[PDB]
Design an enzyme around this catalytic site. Sequence first.
Site, mmCIF file in Angstrom:
data_model
loop_
_atom_site.group_PDB
_atom_site.id
_atom_site.type_symbol
_atom_site.label_atom_id
_atom_site.label_comp_id
_atom_site.label_asym_id
_atom_site.label_seq_id
_atom_site.Cartn_x
_atom_site.Cartn_y
_atom_site.Cartn_z
ATOM 1 C CD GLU A 131 39.091 38.468 32.228
ATOM 2 O OE1 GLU A 131 39.469 37.294 32.026
ATOM 3 O OE2 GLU A 131 38.706 38.876 33.347
ATOM 4 C CG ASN A 172 34.934 44.388 32.799
ATOM 5 O OD1 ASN A 172 35.172 45.497 33.285
ATOM 6 N ND2 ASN A 172 34.977 43.265 33.514
ATOM 7 C CG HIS A 208 41.088 42.509 39.669
ATOM 8 N ND1 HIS A 208 40.370 42.125 38.558
ATOM 9 C CD2 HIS A 208 40.260 42.343 40.728
ATOM 10 C CE1 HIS A 208 39.161 41.744 38.928
ATOM 11 N NE2 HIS A 208 39.067 41.868 40.239
ATOM 12 C CD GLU A 237 35.787 42.203 37.267
ATOM 13 O OE1 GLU A 237 36.696 41.439 37.658
ATOM 14 O OE2 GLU A 237 35.129 42.006 36.216
ATOM 15 C CG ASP A 239 40.497 43.096 43.891
ATOM 16 O OD1 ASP A 239 41.418 43.323 43.088
ATOM 17 O OD2 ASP A 239 39.698 42.144 43.761
#
Length: 324
Positions: A131, A172, A208, A237, A239
């Site tokens: 990030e 990432n 996400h 990651e 979800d």
Amino acid sequence: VSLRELAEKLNIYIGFAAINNFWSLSDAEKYMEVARREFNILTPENQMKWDTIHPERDRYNFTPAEKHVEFAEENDMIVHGHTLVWHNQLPGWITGREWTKEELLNVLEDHIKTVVSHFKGRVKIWDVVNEAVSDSGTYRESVWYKTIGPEYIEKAFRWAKEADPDAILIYNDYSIEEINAKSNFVYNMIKELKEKGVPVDGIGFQMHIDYRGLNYDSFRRNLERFAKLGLQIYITEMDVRIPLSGSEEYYLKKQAEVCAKIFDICLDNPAVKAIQFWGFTDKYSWVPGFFKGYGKALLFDENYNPKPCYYAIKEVLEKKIEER
């Protein structure tokens, strides 16, 4: 047939993020059994981060992370390291004092070489920089950037590759799945780094997202342009959060459709090497605390029972295997 068995047939990895001290949870036995049955890649959710692994300037604690690596190795899973350079959850010895470019650069190199060297050959993939771009398409004004300038990124990757030449190094980030101002900045950032010979082996899309999914055409085109830079791709990651109100049945159905579509598209691009969810049971998820009003974003419910999205993904995987 388990998810990992199907992943093996398609020569990709499917995994999760492991909660802190999962081995001592009240339900550790059930948690670990589901994990080893379904996945072949593991990312420690927090225990490889700065505040845990490097709590004081001259102190290193690899104890928790080693338990994550031990579990992975014992259960035939590769390990995904997370994360070497980030702006959140930094220890007081970093945030509590003023730094100069030279001092912070030495601190950064020392951390990266120590951590990467410690797990040399045991961690296959490292989230080197996490990030580093703002949600406005510019460099994030973190302590690293404000003190060192943009070079901290290139240096982090070169130092990590020196510590472990066999490790796959990736950048990432979140909200860069589609073609937009943020991913455009990331695209140009990485293109430039690789032109300069920087060892950026791949890119990680956090994924996400919510039950509404993504603009799939844009996602497909974005995967393609990053693959053409000669990058390996990782969904890191994932979800799919749903509102905790209304008809759960309706939302879980949309959640399954979203998961199926993402997998369908990813499997069609040979550059995608692995797909991981940020956990696997709704019992243990960062979503409720971060996204107010949302939750139930994973593969299994609080009782470890598979949800609609789990079956949808499995069917997509089986379909790809058959067509091949």
